[PDB]
Amino acid sequence: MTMMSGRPGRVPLQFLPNEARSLPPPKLTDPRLVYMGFLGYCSGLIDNAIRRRPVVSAGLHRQLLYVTSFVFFGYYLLKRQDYMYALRDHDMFAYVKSHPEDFPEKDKKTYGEILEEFHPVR
Amino acid sequence: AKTLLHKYSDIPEGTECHRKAYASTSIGGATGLIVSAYSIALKPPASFLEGVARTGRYTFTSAAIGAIFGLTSCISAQVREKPDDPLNYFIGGCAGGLTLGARTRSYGIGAAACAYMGLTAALVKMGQLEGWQVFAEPKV
Amino acid sequence: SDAPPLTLEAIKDRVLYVLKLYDKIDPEKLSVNSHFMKDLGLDSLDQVEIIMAMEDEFGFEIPDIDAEKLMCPQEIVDYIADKKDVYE
Amino acid sequence: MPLVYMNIIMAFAIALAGLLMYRSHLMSSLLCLEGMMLSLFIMSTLIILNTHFTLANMMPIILLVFAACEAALGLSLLVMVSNTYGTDYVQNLNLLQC
Amino acid sequence: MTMYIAFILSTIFVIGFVGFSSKPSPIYGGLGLIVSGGVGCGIVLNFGGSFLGLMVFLIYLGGMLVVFGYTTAMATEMYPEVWVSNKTVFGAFVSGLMMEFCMVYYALKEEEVEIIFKFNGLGDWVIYDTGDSGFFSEEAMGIAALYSYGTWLVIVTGWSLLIGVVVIMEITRGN
Amino acid sequence: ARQWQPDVEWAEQFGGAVMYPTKETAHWKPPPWNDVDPPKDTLVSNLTLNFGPQ
Amino acid sequence: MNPIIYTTLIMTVMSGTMLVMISSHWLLIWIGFEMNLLAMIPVLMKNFNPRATEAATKYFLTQATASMMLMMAIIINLLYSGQWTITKMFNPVAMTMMTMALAMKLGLSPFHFWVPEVTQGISLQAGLLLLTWQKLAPLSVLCQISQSINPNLMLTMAMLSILIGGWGGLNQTQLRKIMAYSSIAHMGWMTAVLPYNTTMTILNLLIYITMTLAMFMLLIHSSATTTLSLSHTWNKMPVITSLMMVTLLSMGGLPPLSGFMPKWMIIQEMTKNESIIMPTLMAMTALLNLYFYMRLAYSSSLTMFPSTNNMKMKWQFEHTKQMKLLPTMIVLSTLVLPMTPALSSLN
Amino acid sequence: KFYIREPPHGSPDWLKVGLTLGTSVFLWIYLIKQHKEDVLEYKRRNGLE
Amino acid sequence: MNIMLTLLTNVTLASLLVLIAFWLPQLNAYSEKTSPYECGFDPMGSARLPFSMKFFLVAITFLLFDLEIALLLPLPWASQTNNLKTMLTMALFLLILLAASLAYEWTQKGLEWAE
């Protein structure tokens, strides 16, 4: 089953709806973006290794392009992921609010009133 | 199909051992027929007589396993007066395994089968008791 | 699997079965070491026919040469053993 | 369902069983494929005519077109196999195993 | 039950299918498929589908001719098999005929369910429309709507046919 | 004083058609080095026809 | 074959897949499948080498039978409800027919027999195409009709695929058949979670596709189709063998590599639906795949096999044509697990 | 030196190098501007600034 | 119903002609008379031996070209639609693609018989 494909008001191939602009964009020092750049750098090193070039220093323009492409794609990927999680939370909270009988608020007893069985260790 | 499964399951465990053994025999025979059909399809028997012999051998082995399992499990659940106990199933499973060894004429096969079938039979009983789901219906 | 490990006894049995299937030879008479001409009174064309029967039995071409010498069942067995590489 | 519908469905089932049970010739199996296509055409046409689905009347014709592409494809392969073996027997297609 | 025309045609359809599915020589398989095609054309005509039935019969006749030509070249088999020339072919043919007869008997006098639904018979004349209107043919109008409504269908079908020509010429190249 | 490395006897176990040879499967042969089998020179017979005398 | 004809046939294959994935009409989905098969048959025969003819014939027969079953399922669904839109398949018999037809198209057990033969019969590039691009359309159709799939039949076929792929891969010394059995097992993993969550199916498909692309491009770079031929690569390109070993470890599902992410994400999902025994059996069965990946890693990278004298000649020449997406493919197929939550972008 | 002239040699392909650096710089500038606009739009929607 | 009667009448007349042809004259059939005819000498091989088709590619192409006429036959009815421009565009597109396929087969020697 697909859980949010048929969500009402969804534009087929948008990848970034307008409402997503209400969310704080990921910071450019986001550790996930740094990991994206690290993946780009590793791709550049492996490209040097396969082509039989000095791995660390062969092509700096190529390594820079690798890192830049990975960071550029990762930024929008993080934005979409954050938007989707925000949508999930929004729908969950709204559904809880609109169905009070299914999520009843329960008065909680204190541990001085609850009787738990004691199992000695011996 | 599912009719055989419900025919076996409807009879209470430690009662009417003949009917339970008959139902288990039918289930085993159906399994043996399926195995025979697939074996004939993927491994041709080079003649009609040899194919009939192979099909009869497989079906008889499976039906004997089912009959012996059902009879011993029901009798164990009856003499011990303890239904809903996986031990009966384990004993039944062992008997089937022993029968398999007897049919294939091997101690190693017989010993291995007795331990493995018995454990599986016991696990099936535990799943019946606790409601374990093999094919779980989607819920979330 | 493929053909079984044929033995010298199998070769001898097949050769003698083929020879006893020839009309111009009395079955109880011929031995393994019996010459085709001297003991059995056969001529060259009968030997050629026997060699062709051997070719049919064992399924491999025996040329005109290496057939002018196979003159009793025993040398026929030796020839088949050498060609098929059997020793025991 | 009337008897005609189950007769067409039975024809489809028979043709499928004929395809799935090879004897020797690949051409026989291709004939079974064409027969399955024909049963599908008849069934779809009967359903469309009975319910007066006017636009769907173009659907069976399209179904015919891609039938030919399947036949012409299969025949092509039957040529190549033949050119390898001088025979269209399916037993010769055993170079690749599982 | 009225004149049994549709039922008879459908039964002959099934019989021809059994005939070519028993897999005799492809000559006789082509003959059985031709009989089935003509009978199916008759079935479709009995429901008002004149164009579709004639169209499929014309297409099949042409297709079978190519199959006959190919059979004489690549599926020749010095002693070609007829339905009574081999125990396997005769057995398959008899099994198909018997299964068809058993299914018809089970669905005819009684109302039995085989796979999906059941049938009582009643003749296929029952489910007709009673519609009384029109100076045209609904089937012809629907088929002719292909060039105005079905632009996408025409595009994909034409591309597929052109690709099929290219594909057959690639496959038969060899080298 | 040297680390063991595979030799020809060790490498030959992976050169068959299957990993575990079986009585029936031992007759399977590995595919050709290129995926090209020897051309099956099938004798496609020509039709022999009498033209005349009638 | 002409490069233009090859390009147009590849375009036709992708166009058939796209027509399947963008259509709302059952007839257009069937037409897309037909077009895909028609254009796919000559791609498998690009090099004549009669084994390719055998592979193409087997593939054509299997796919055409599946197409016939698919059309019958469509027609039965139309008969019981005059609907052409791709939806939950109002009739159950038609649903069973479509499930079987799509399983035959994908190669799920017990319809798996054709996959090892076709993969072994074709070239490595054709095998790459067959094992990556050909899975999209049947899986895309299955995702659209998942709410009506009988869980019992689909889960039986998935378990059978996992078991059979694991067992079949153990006996293989040919690399293409190993890839085929890996493909069967991953297909089973894909379809096991389909009735519960299609996002997990898509995630598994993407991870499997990137790993398969990496492995096939690596086997193309070092022109090896057998174990013994791949055992010569260390003496020519050690880096290629090292990356191959890491990718093989990833395909086995070992943490912290990428191939662990799908299984981990599937088991969890199956547990939220109170399915415990099934994920346990699948997880323990994947150890067979791990074993026959590890055997290849032993043969190719972790030990050094004997080489040949003529290999010295090969030391003097470089790989001329380079695959640009191979480094990205390797990195994505190994070092991606920390970015797992990005899967939420797939729903 | 070498037997074959090795056309790819001490003079690097300056068109390719320039294209690569230009693509990287354009991507970085676009990303910086996009982040700036995203922050401004987010603060505008939420009534922060 | 009238067409069925016409078909039955024609088939009955032909079958009756065959029956009179086979039952009216005096038959003297012996093995030499019924032997196959090959101009006075015995045939060497069988007539059920494979017979090469040199026009096999044209034969395969004939299937696709035959389905194209099935596509083109509803044109008289299609010419009655209001969207005449669309119908004309699609009809010309179909014919142009058929002509292009014929041209492609022609240029790549697809119409030449095998030798």
Ligand SMILES: CCCCCCCCCCCCCCCCCC(=O)OC[C@H](COP(=O)([O-])OCC(O)COP(=O)([O-])OC[C@@H](COC(=O)CCCCCCCCCCCCCCCCC)OC(=O)CCCCCCCCCCCCCCCCC)OC(=O)CCCCCCCCCCCCCCCCC
């Ligand atoms: C870190 C943890 C450490 C644990 C790990 C290590 C320990 C565990 C592993 C070691 C034990 C595993 C071995 C199990 C059996 C494997 C047999 C085998 O491999 O077959 C291939 C092997 C190859 O045979 P083949 O080449 O095909 O045919 C040629 C024959 O070899 C040549 O033919 P043959 O003429 O020379 O001999 C054949 C014939 C002739 O026999 C003989 O020649 C000599 C006699 C041998 C059997 C005598 C047993 C009767 C007396 C023992 C009573 C219990 C021990 C004392 C307890 C005192 C209590 C205070 O044998 C029989 O007829 C015996 C049939 C059945 C009688 C025994 C079954 C009794 C069941 C026990 C019930 C226990 C219930 C709970 C009780 C609670 C209270 C303690 O077969 C054999 O040679 C062995 C046959 C004897 C098997 C029975 C012996 C095992 C006894 C204990 C079993 C329980 C252990 C497993 C537990 C889970 C299972 C449910």
Ligand SMILES: CCCCCCCCCCCCCCCCCC(=O)OC[C@H](COP(=O)([O-])OCC(O)COP(=O)([O-])OC[C@@H](COC(=O)CCCCCCCCCCCCCCCCC)OC(=O)CCCCCCCCCCCCCCCCC)OC(=O)CCCCCCCCCCCCCCCCC
């Ligand atoms: C949920 C979100 C996620 C979605 C995930 C989606 C799926 C993920 C990936 C799926 C699996 C990928 C598998 C790739 C298969 C590769 C097969 C292959 O080509 O050979 C292997 C190839 C062989 O390597 P090699 O041995 O060195 O090459 C030797 C030659 O093959 C030796 O042969 P040659 O001598 O003949 O050389 C000829 C060569 C050189 O080529 C040339 O010379 C060019 C000359 C131009 C010819 C002019 C032709 C124009 C006339 C034809 C018109 C046709 C119209 C058809 C339309 C009909 C409409 C009904 O051309 C080629 O080699 C192949 C050409 C490829 C053309 C591709 C065109 C795409 C068609 C798209 C159709 C869709 C249209 C819309 C549909 C609407 C609905 C109806 O290896 C690779 O290519 C490496 C793998 C790279 C794969 C890509 C990696 C993943 C993709 C990442 C990109 C981003 C994707 C996401 C984008 C999202 C939207 C923006």
Ligand SMILES: CCCCCCCCCCCCCCCCC[C@@H](O)O[C@H](CO[C@H](O)CCCCCCCCCCCCCCC)COP(=O)(O)OCC[N+](C)(C)C
């Ligand atoms: C190995 C890791 C995966 C690699 C995959 C390839 C990487 C390259 C990126 C591919 C570029 C194409 C995507 C960006 C173009 C815009 C996409 C847009 O047009 O389409 C949207 C779709 O966007 C895409 O879904 C998002 C693509 C993001 C892929 C990354 C997820 C990987 C999983 C997490 C693993 C971590 C890897 C991160 C990279 C290192 C429309 O969504 P919608 O039509 O409504 O849903 C379709 C599916 N439904 C209907 C069934 C629900």
Ligand SMILES: CCCCCCCCCCCCCCCCC[C@@H](O)O[C@H](CO[C@H](O)CCCCCCCCCCCCCCC)COP(=O)(O)OCC[N+](C)(C)C
């Ligand atoms: C133009 C198209 C329309 C024509 C309309 C008329 C249709 C005519 C039917 C076509 C057949 C014409 C055949 C004409 C000759 C008759 C041949 C046959 O019927 O006679 C003999 C039939 O007799 C049989 O030997 C057996 C006779 C009795 C046994 C079975 C018949 C039982 C009927 C009961 C008769 C008792 C009296 C009935 C009174 C009504 C068979 O002899 P046979 O040599 O092989 O064939 C060669 C005939 N020759 C000699 C003329 C060359």
Ligand SMILES: CCCCCCCCCCCC(=O)SCCNC(=O)CCNC(=O)[C@H](O)C(C)(C)COP(=O)(O)O
């Ligand atoms: C269906 C019926 C068709 C009939 C077709 C008939 C075909 C006729 C073919 C005629 C060909 C010849 O005559 S060929 C000419 C044959 N003539 C000679 O060889 C002369 C010397 N004769 C001998 O050496 C021995 O007597 C010998 C008998 C050979 C035994 O040889 P062995 O000492 O080594 O056993």
